[PDB]
Structure 1
Amino acid sequence: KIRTLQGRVVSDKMEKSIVVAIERFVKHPIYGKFIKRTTKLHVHDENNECGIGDVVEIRECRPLSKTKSWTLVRVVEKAV
């Protein structure tokens, strides 16, 4: 297939853009305990679709903005 992430929608107080958060359960280098290492990405999407709290397939693309360089594929798990 192609490189695509899972993420979670965080900051949608703006237009045609979203800051997603993707969780990384990495292993600590020296202490061996798994830490919930967060990662936040300015991700471009199409016209204002979703809200907060929904897992969102997102793939790498052109640098559409200064920071936004990823594209939202689809919205999964709509909730309250």
Structure 2
Amino acid sequence: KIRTLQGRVVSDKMEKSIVVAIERFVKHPIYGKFIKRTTKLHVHDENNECGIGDVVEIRECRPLSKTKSWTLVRVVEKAV
């Protein structure tokens, strides 16, 4: 299959694009504590179906603008 990620929409307001925060949960190298850690990504969506506060899966593609090398596959869990 394809490698994909899941994350939540952190903001919405851009012209056929979105930005998604990813939560990786990584152990501290010295201290041995599992710490949450984000990764904000500029993600493309044609016809901008996902709004703010959603949860969306996301795959990597060719560059579509500056940063923006990521595009959604499936919007889940939109509940407001």
**Bin for the TM-score computed over the shorter chain:** over 0.9
- The alpha carbon displacement at 1:39 in A equals 0.6
Q: When the two structures are superposed, what TM-score results if normalisation uses the length of structure 2?
A: 0.95
Q: When the two structures are superposed, what TM-score results if normalisation uses the length of structure 1?
A: 0.95
- The alpha carbon displacement at 1:58 in A equals 0.3
Q: Deviations over 1:38-75 (max 9, x none)?
A: 11001111112121122111000000111111011011
Q: Which residues of structure 1 form unaligned runs of 5+?
A: none
- List structure 1 runs of 4+ shifted beyond 6 angstroms: none
Q: SS of the counterpart of 2:47?
A: coil
Distance in structure 2 (CA, Å) of the matches to 1:67 and 1:38: 17
Question: How many pairs align?
Answer: 80
- The alpha carbon displacement at 1:13 in A equals 1.2
CA RMSD of aligned residues (A): 0.8
Q: SS of the counterpart of 2:48?
A: coil
Q: Deviations over 1:5-42 (max 9, x none)?
A: 00110110111111100001000000001111111001
Between structures 1 and 2, the one with greater strand share: 2
Distance in structure 1 (CA, Å) of the matches to 2:37 and 2:68: 21
- The alpha carbon displacement at 1:78 in A equals 1.5
Q: Which residues of structure 2 form unaligned runs of 5+?
A: none
